[PDB]
Amino acid sequence: VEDTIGEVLEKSIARLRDTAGISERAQIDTICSALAILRPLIPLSVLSAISGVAGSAIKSFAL
C-alpha cells in the first residue's frame, strides 16, 4: 500500500531509538548492521555471538 517504500519504517525505528535507555542506543544500531549483511536464514545464536547482544533484547526489539 506504500507508494514510496520505507518511509514509515524509518519513522518507526527513529522513534524506537529515541525512547530507549542511553546504554541501548549502540546495541540497536549493532542489530541493524548485523541484519543488513547476513544470508537469509539467520539463527539467533550466531547473531548474538557476533553482536554481543542478548537474545531477549533482540526478541523484544522485533516484537
Next chain:
Amino acid sequence: PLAVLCIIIDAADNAQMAAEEIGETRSFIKDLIREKLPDGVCLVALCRPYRRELLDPPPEALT
C-alpha cells in the same frame, strides 16, 4: 476564536552551553521543549546550525 499565543526563545544554545560549562546538564529549554503545552500556543527556538544538537529535539519537531 482563532487567536494564538507565541513564545520565543532567542539564542537557545547559549543557555545550554552556560549550563554545561559549570557542571549542570539541564537548562530550562532542554526540558521545556519536551513538555506538552495547551492548545492554541506555539513554541519557536532559534540557533546556529552546528550547535543544534545541544538541545536534542524529539522526533515530532519541525526544522
